[PDB]
Each structure stands twice: as structure tokens, then as C-alpha cells.
Amino acid sequence: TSVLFTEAELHTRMRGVAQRIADDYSNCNLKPLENPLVIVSVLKGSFVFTADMVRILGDFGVPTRVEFLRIRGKHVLVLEDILDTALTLREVVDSLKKSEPASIKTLVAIDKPGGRKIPFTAEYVVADVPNVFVVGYGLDYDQSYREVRDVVILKPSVY
């Protein structure tokens, strides 16, 4: 029914976010093959946000290494497409911290603070969205509309 964030807007947020993640990961200073910085992507919705973010991090001198789902001694940065109930991200963060990560943070593209079932605050957020059902930029409704380059609100008369 309306567009919330276009691809130009989503990239602009990820400029300062990558600039933020660059500052907070300066003293550790890890490079390819040595320590890669394990980008933990949560399939399937976060594959659009992952392919764009790992490149922008490389633009600011932050190498990456991507693992997909749905260790130890190395830093971990979990990437979710949307942070709503935070239940799925809670289980991943706890299950990952078991294999002694040298650091762990979370980076989400769309954050819905009003739809939480448990208290959870991500370290880096691209954009905030009110409590509505949205698609685009990896977000889907029954495995569809992920190809939309913008985060939009779907019309309810499709159900």
C-alpha cells in the first residue's frame, strides 16, 4: 500500500552502519585467512541484506566470511533480515556463544521493536519499522516478493 524504505535509503543507512562496525572492530584488526570475521546469515530472508552488506563492509576495509543456516576463537556477527519477535535470533546467539566466539554482535536490516516476545536489543540496526507486515529486500510472504528492491507494505486483500 506504500513504500517504507527504498534501496537508496537502505544503502544510505548501511553506509553509517558499516562506518560504525568499522570503528568498533578496529583494534581487533582481522584479515582474510587469518581471522575472517564470521558473518552469520539466517536464511532465507537475509540473503539480500547479506550480499549487499559484506561488500559495503569491504568498502570500509572490513573483510568477511559468510556462513548460512536454516567456529571458536573467531569473532561472530549474526545478520538477520528482520528483527520482530527476536525468538529466532535469541536461539542463534545462544547456540553460537557455546563455541567460544572471540566476540558476538547482531546486525539487523529491519527492526520492529513493538513486536517483541522477549527483550532483545541488536547492536547495529539499519532501519526501524512500525508494527506492520512488510515485504521486499529479502522479506517474503509465503516465499514471494523477496525480489522487491524496496521494503514496502503489502495490501491485505491478497490473503
Add this chain to the structure above:
Amino acid sequence: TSVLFTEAELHTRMRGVAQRIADDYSNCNLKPLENPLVIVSVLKGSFVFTADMVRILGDFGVPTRVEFLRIRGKHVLVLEDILDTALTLREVVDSLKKSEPASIKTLVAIDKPGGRKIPFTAEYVVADVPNVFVVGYGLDYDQSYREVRDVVILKPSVY
């Protein structure tokens, strides 16, 4: 040691490729929720090429639905990041055709025809590359350098 294809070059090829896949998939005409067109992505190297291609297909009116690895009644389009020995893509195409796909083709980003162990020709190819070891745009060496926005040839003195 040199750059083979930049992101601007890789996108330009995917313009005519998406224009090609749009023509060959016109009469079937399948839309979200109905028949999605199952984009079959082969992790991990093909996640950069998948996030860029599904959007470009949407720009030419071609909806998608992405599945990841490493059915029946619906069209299948497998996407690989690089087509070298074609052994990995051979096993996927055969294993997918068992569950009665209403169509099946292959779309690769980088094709190395000189490195084949078995004869295999993909329907759509973004770009051809001579028999060298390359990284970037999802391509990796020991889970690294995927974040490079361009397809480049790595220096041998890193081994």
C-alpha cells in the same frame, strides 16, 4: 594480479541475460503465490550472484522464489556462481529433475569451459573466464574474498 570483470561489467551482462530469460519465460507467465519460478541457489559462492539477479529479473517482470542448498509442478532455474568442472551442477540438475519440474535450466555467472570434467552447457551465462583461479562476487579461496565487488585473479604468493 588483475581485474577480469567489475561489478558494472557483471551487471551489464545480467541486463541482457534477464532480458533473455524474460523472453524464454513469457508464455508460461507465472506470478507470486501461483507459480513462483524456483530460483535454486548453490551455497555459498552463489549468494552474491543470487541477490543481484533476482532483483534484475524483477525489473524485467520476472518474479522469483529462492531455495538454498549446501518442488514438482513448478519451473526450476538453478543458479551457480561459477561453472568449472560442472560435476556439482550435474548432480543438482539430475537430483532436481526427479521431482517433476515443469521446466529446468541453469544460469551461471562465471563459466570456465576449459575446466570441464564432463560435457555441460548452461542455458544462460553471464560471462566467460579463461582457466585461471579467480575470486570476488561470491567466489572464494578458503572462505575469503567473497566480499570483493569484482571478479579478479588472485596473486599466487598467498598459498
